[PDB]
């Protein structure tokens, strides 16, 4: 019952390599190989760029003066930018350039965990002497394909309209192929080899990918009602002034339930709340059938 292992990993390019597995019993090259191909293509860490805020751009459907690329084209180009990070799950970079000439991927400011695999990669060109583009490229890490459309549900104030969300291309793997040839080890009846020839963008090492693949593969074998809802709404739902909201939050009042417990006395004793603010709060609470000094006794359940 011989278990396999790896052997010479031949790197022919920054792009792709051929990993090989010596000790494989009868027919196991296929069983292991295809299963490995699956996890390899499907589930793998990736760092693909997500959010991009550009200079004078409100939407991806405009054209910036001084660049022959449409903004949507520039986003599509960025999506094809391959980067690798170490300690950060999400880093934000800053791109800056001007004058006549191509803007490559090496024109960005270099950070601690930033590694650019394709410095020659073209983000966009520059057509005029004085024309300049700055942008924040927000790069985060994830698995699989996360389109830009499903990215908005959580929402939670993506208000900086200058920020254009882009589809997530997370995956090192481009092409994976596995060939089994009979492998003759010195002494043994008949054994097979596994030549997995994979294609990458360079952001993942072959040994690393081949490792995590079988890591996950084995990892699957591991099993082989009273009170008002309004009381739990955040204070922002009350739509108070910025000052009042910040003051309340500073007094550990984050929800409506917290506010309706406080009395006028107690609120006036705070360092930042005057009579105007209290008037506002009482007004907005009364406008929704609420008030101060309300008792709900049992704060909180779970």
């Amino acid at each position: 019952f011989l278990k396999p292992r790896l052997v010479d990993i031949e790197q022919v390019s920054s792009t792709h390599a051929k990993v090989t597995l010596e000790p494989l019993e009868r027919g196991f090259g296929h069983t292991l190989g295809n299963a490995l191909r699956r996890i390899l293509l499907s589930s793998m860490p990736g760092c693909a760029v997500t959010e991009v805020e550009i200079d004078g751009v409100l939407h991806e459907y405009s054209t910036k003066e001084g660049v022959q690329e449409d903004i949507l084209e520039i986003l599509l180009n960025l999506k094809g930018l391959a980067v690798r990070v170490q300690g950060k799950d999400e880093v934000i970079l800053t791109l800056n350039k001007s004058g006549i000439g191509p803007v490559t991927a090496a024109d960005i400011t270099h950070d601690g965990d930033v590694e650019i695999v394709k410095p020659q990669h073209v983000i966009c060109h520059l057509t005029d002497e004085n024309a300049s583009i700055s942008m924040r490229i927000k790069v985060q890490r994830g698995r699989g394909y996360v389109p830009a459309s499903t990215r908005i549900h959580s929402e939670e104030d993506e208000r900086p309209i200058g920020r254009l969300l882009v589809d997530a291309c997370y995956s090192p793997v481009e092409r994976i192929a596995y060939n089994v040839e009979a492998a003759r080890v010195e002494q043994r009846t008949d054994l097979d080899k596994l030549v997995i020839e994979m294609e990458t963008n360079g952001t993942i090492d072959p040994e690393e990918a081949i490792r995590r693949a079988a890591t996950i593969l084995a990892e699957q074998l591991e099993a082989f009602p009273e009170f008002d809802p309004i009381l739990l709404r955040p204070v922002d739902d009350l739509e108070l002034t910025v000052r009042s909201a910040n003051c309340l939050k500073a007094e550990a009042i984050h929800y409506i339930g917290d506010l309706v417990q406080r009395t006028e006395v107690e609120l006036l004793k705070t360092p930042n709340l005057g009579k105007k603010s209290l008037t506002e709060i009482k007004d907005v609470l009364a406008s929704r059938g609420l008030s101060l000094g309300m008792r709900l006794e049992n704060w909180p359940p779970a």
């Binding site: 008002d228 009381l231 059938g289 309300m294 709900l296």
Partner: protein, 50 residues
């Protein structure tokens, strides 16, 4: 109000029908609505307001 009843009655009319009239009644309502104001009573009616 006119609830499950024909038209509706002035506070004085409600006073005539209650034998205890005027300001008195106006107070009850104020304390009545009040009892309905606070939640666990008001949470059902609150959702009706959009």
């Amino acid at each position: 109000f006119g609830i499950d009843m024909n038209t509706d009655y002035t506070l004085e009319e409600v006073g005539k029908q209650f034998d205890v009239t005027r300001e008195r009644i106006r107070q009850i309502e104020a304390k009545a609505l009040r009892k309905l104001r606070h939640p666990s009573r008001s949470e059902v009616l609150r959702s009706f307001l959009d």
